[PDB]
């Protein structure tokens, strides 16, 4: 309590002395000479000294007169049922200046590992209302499904549409949406806020906002916070949660930043090296547990470098995350909204989520025949790539009407259009 033995300040780090009972990854708060107060977290503890990182920074600290207090608990998020309708910062602190929230209980944000046998497989699909997602790589409750896109491809716009139109057919209780904004600009953040207010989803949603201005170490916590709140709603309160996290790329950038700040030797391709485990720890907090009502679904939005050479490796996560959804600007150029390249997108859990009793079962057969129509329809128009002098010009025009029609209509249904699955099926029938 209120130790006053700061012996070093280097960069954003500090060294404290004559402290005992200090655990690793333990939150501290610093009392400066000017009465300012800052939060930091223990990152290394020796026999008597300990070493911490300050979130806000070390500018303005006088070591002789500053003081440190060890809280005695790691990073926590207070959980309450009153979260809905609310906006929080990176560390789950109110950002809308609303009523004070009394936490039901304070939860460690790292979470726990579901026992493999305990986990329950996902068998029921979720109607996105997007023909280019529902029919084919369909999304099931509890699935880990990510959308890959480049900046300015409308990836954020698609994410908004999914949030607005997400629902399930049983609908005994309504859906719940947890949205995390990770290291994104104000303009980007504002887009989502405006959509939710306008559409009224704020009353039905909970969100955590972390902008680029905010410190990198708050980005790490931001995902953990959103998933911990999602788990609280999902399992303790039985809700059905859709978790949407926007640009885990910058979470990964922050991961590298923190690793360099902690003087950790880089891993593969200059990244920390525990990225595989860190991402998998995040992404695997999904699915349904047997014996519990609620469920957790994740649609992480990820900015994708055009090159495969560097950033948060698509296949580093892609095989972690049970399928993926691809957006491309080449697509986007010709009024194709939401630009979903359907060639390389898959939902790993599509087969089981698709059947009579959960879907109208034209759908599995019709999806497979339209999957053949994807391949053959591509053959018909997509594969030409300005070639096909003779190919598709020999009364394959059925083909050479199919796929261009499909690419325009089906992929660009309009960002504010909601297609009931049966309809999507029907427009597939029309295209048949």
């Amino acid at each position: 309590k209120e130790y006053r033995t700061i012996k070093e300040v280097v960069g954003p780090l500090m060294a404290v002395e004559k402290v005992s009972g200090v655990k690793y990854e333990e939150l501290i708060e610093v009392r400066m000479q000017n009465g300012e107060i800052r939060r930091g977290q223990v990152l290394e503890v020796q026999e008597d000294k300990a070493m911490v990182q300050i979130f806000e920074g070390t500018s303005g600290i006088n070591l002789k007169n500053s003081s440190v207090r060890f809280l005695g608990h790691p990073l926590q998020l207070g959980v309450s049922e009153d979260m809905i309708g609310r906006v929080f910062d990176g560390l789950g602190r109110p950002k809308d200046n609303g009523p004070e929230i009394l936490p039901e209980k304070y939860l460690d944000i790292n979470g726990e590992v579901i026992n493999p046998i305990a986990r329950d497989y996902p068998d029921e699909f979720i109607q996105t209302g997007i023909s280019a997602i529902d029919h084919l790589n369909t999304l099931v409750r509890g699935q880990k499904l990510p959308v890959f896109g480049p900046p300015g491809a409308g990836k954020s716009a698609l994410a908004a549409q999914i949030a607005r139109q997400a629902t399930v057919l049983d609908s005994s209780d309504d859906f719940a949406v947890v949205f995390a904004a990770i290291g994104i600009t104000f303009e980007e953040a504002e887009f989502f806020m405006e959509d939710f207010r306008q559409t009224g989803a704020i009353d039905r949603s909970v969100m955590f906002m972390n902008l680029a201005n905010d410190p990198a170490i708050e980005r790490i916590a931001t995902p953990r916070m959103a998933l911990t709140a999602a788990e609280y709603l999902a399992y303790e309160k039985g809700m059905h949660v859709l978790v949407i996290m926007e640009d885990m790329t910058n979470y990964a950038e922050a991961l590298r930043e923190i690793s360099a700040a902690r003087r950790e030797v880089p891993g593969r391709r200059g990244y920390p090296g525990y990225l595989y485990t860190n991402l998998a720890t995040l992404f695997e907090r999904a699915g349904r547990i047997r014996g519990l009502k609620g469920s957790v679904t994740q649609i992480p939005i990820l900015t994708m470098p055009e090159d495969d050479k560097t950033h948060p490796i698509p296949d580093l996560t892609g095989y972690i995350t049970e399928g993926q959804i691809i957006l491309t600007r080449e697509l986007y150029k010709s009024g194709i909204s939401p630009p979903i390249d359907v060639l390389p997108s898959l939902s790993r859990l599509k087969d089981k989520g698709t059947g009579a009793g959960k879907t109208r079962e034209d759908h599995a057969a019709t999806m497979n025949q339209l999957f053949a129509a994807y391949a053959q329809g591509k053959q018909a128009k997509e594969l030409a790539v300005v070639l096909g002098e003779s190919a598709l010009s020999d009364i394959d025009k059925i083909y050479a009407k199919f796929a261009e029609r499909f690419e325009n209509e089906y992929v660009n249904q309009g960002f504010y259009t909601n297609r009931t699955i049966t309809e999507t099926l029907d427009l597939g029938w029309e295209l048949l």
Partner: protein, 584 residues
């Protein structure tokens, strides 16, 4: 106060013992000469210090003195129309005080003319409740910019006595009974550079900036409060792009930061800006322009200090309600400074040697810019438009600087060496250069112009994109393998880039091209193309369809500074209609 003894000197790193009372990131006078420096890390009672002046000749045993304050800029009357050192030392006073034409070490210069007498007319009334940002009176620093004096942060209370009169920057002009004690304030306030000036609310930028430059305003526009990047190889026109938009932008104030760049460029600006006048109010551009010079020879730590000082001044004039446009010349120079400082500290290297926090530093900068609601009761709206120039590697732009830059900005003007090589001096590359504001700008433009202009710009860009395909097709035959419409479409794209796109060659008339003229120019071009095509369909053949008026290209140069553009530009429309039908 306590004196620190230098115990180590390695390059720009200075370590000094007995510095217990100092705090982190405090400016300090280091050495006998007292060169300026900053405390970046403290271990026990010793302090590692980063200096902003050449330490050649500094040794151990010399004294070190702290100023007990972080890096800050003097914010008061006198700022406008002045050129400053990266740490806000005014260069003109510097020259006179030192009686030398070079930059020496250890000079102590107040940033603002404290001795000059200003006429302050008070606007607040005694008894008024005041808060941070509330404006009490205004000094007419220029006939254009009224220097609005406002209550600093951390001060709230009731005014006691305030009266208009002649005061200097140091004389107290007003006093407030605050919560505890009495606070008397001057027309000047200090502000720490690194931390952004607080605001009440941030807003979306949806007001296009009139660059004057045709390609920018028509195709890749930047809104008031937005951010733009100019990546380009050497010899491309990025420096002069910042110059042109600093000259002609419809923005109340302009802040120019030239870190790590040639000194002739800054000298050129201070000579030509007073010579350039603006007829809207009859006075030079320097009455509104501010300059901060940190050349390549000047020390590297000052290169970061320069961009931060620049934006702190911009945020100051933004809290007054004005719009500001700040442009940093070759932010790479800033990043390259930060890289060697990371290497000398033996930090864990990030990408390409840059520190891991590069993307964070960059993100903090551009997000300080924007259209905001300033602090105070009136809740006035101010904006900062950020222009960043990036010079990287060879032509290759895929390096941490531009990539992190484009992650946080919505406007990309990409210059390529080939276009500048062909003396397409406005070398903004089309089809890559993109403005994410373009769709919002279209709505604004249509309402302001009460005409369908958005469809015109989509048609222009679609024609240009079409031409890219026809270049690959043209390999077979130059003019006999293509189609008739394709040949005409080629001639239209040629006209777009050779007339609309190409901008000034330092020609007065070809430099600005008002928005009204931009409309008429693009309309005459577009009408010619679509008339010639649709009229070509009815048995009109291209062999002599290209005929008569080619002077349209030439025509766009003239009639700018006077309103002679309406007659001259629409007469081209009617004339081309007549001649199209006559050709039949």
């Amino acid at each position: 106060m306590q004196i620190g003894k230098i115990i180590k000197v390695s390059g720009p790193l200075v370590m000094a013992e007995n510095m217990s009372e100092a705090s982190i990131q405090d400016m300090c006078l280091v050495g006998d000469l007292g060169v300026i420096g900053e405390i970046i890390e403290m271990r026990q009672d010793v302090a590692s210090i980063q200096v902003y002046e050449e330490t050649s000749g500094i040794g151990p045993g010399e004294p070190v003195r702290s100023t007990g304050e972080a890096l800050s800029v003097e914010l008061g009357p006198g700022i406008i129309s002045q050129m400053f050192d990266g740490i806000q030392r005014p260069l003109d006073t510097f020259m006179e005080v030192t009686q030398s034409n070079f930059l020496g070490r250890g000079v102590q210069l107040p940033a603002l003319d404290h001795e000059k007498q200003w006429w302050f007319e008070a606007t607040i009334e005694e008894g008024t409740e005041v808060s941070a940002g509330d404006i009490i009176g205004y000094v007419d620093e220029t006939k254009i910019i009224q220097h609005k004096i406002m209550v600093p942060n951390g001060i709230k209370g009731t005014v006691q006595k305030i009266e208009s009169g002649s005061f200097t920057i140091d004389d107290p002009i007003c006093v407030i009974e605050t919560e505890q004690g009495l606070k008397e304030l001057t027309m000047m306030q200090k502000w720490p550079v690194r931390r952004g000036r607080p605001i009440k609310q941030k807003l979306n930028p949806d007001v296009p900036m009139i660059t004057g430059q045709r390609v920018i305003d028509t195709f890749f526009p930047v809104t008031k409060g937005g951010a733009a990047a100019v990546p380009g190889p050497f010899g491309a026109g990025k420096t002069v792009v910042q110059h042109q938009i600093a000259k002609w932008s419809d923005v109340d104030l302009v802040v120019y930061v030239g870190c790590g760049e040639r000194g002739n460029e800054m000298t050129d600006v201070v000579n030509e800006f007073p010579e350039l006048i603006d007829p809207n109010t009859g006075e030079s551009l320097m009455e509104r322009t501010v300059l901060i010079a940190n050349t390549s020879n000047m020390p590297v730590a000052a290169r970061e200090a320069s961009i931060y000082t620049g934006i702190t001044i911009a945020e100051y004039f933004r809290d007054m309600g004005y719009d500001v446009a700040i442009m940093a010349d070759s932010t790479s120079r800033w990043a390259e400074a930060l890289r060697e400082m990371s290497g000398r500290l033996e930090e864990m290297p990030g990408d390409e040697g840059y520190p891991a926090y590069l993307g964070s530093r960059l993100a903090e900068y551009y997000e300080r810019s924007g259209r905001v609601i300033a602090l105070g009761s009136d809740q006035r709206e101010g904006s900062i438009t950020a222009i960043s120039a990036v010079s990287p590697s060879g032509g290759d732009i895929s390096e941490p600087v531009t990539q992190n830059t484009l992650r946080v900005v919505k406007v990309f003007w990409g210059l390529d060496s080939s276009l500048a090589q062909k003396r397409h001096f406005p070398s903004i590359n089309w089809i890559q250069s993109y403005s994410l504001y373009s769709t919002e700008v279209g709505r604004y433009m249509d309402q302001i112009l009460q005409q369908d202009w958005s469809d015109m710009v989509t048609e222009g860009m679609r024609i240009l994109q079409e031409e890219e395909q026809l270049n690959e097709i043209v390999r077979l035959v130059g003019i006999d393998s293509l189609s008739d419409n394709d040949r005409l479409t080629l001639e239209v794209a040629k006209s777009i880039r050779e007339d609309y796109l190409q901008q000034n060659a330092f020609d007065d008339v070809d430099t600005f091209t008002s928005r009204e003229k931009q409309f008429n120019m693009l309309k005459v071009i577009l009408t010619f193309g679509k008339e010639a095509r649709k009229a070509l369909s009815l048995g009109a053949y291209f062999n002599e369809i290209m005929e008569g008026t080619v002077a349209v290209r030439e025509r766009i140069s003239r009639s700018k500074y006077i309103p002679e553009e309406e007659l001259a530009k629409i007469s081209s429309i009617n004339e081309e209609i007549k001649e199209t039908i006559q050709l039949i």
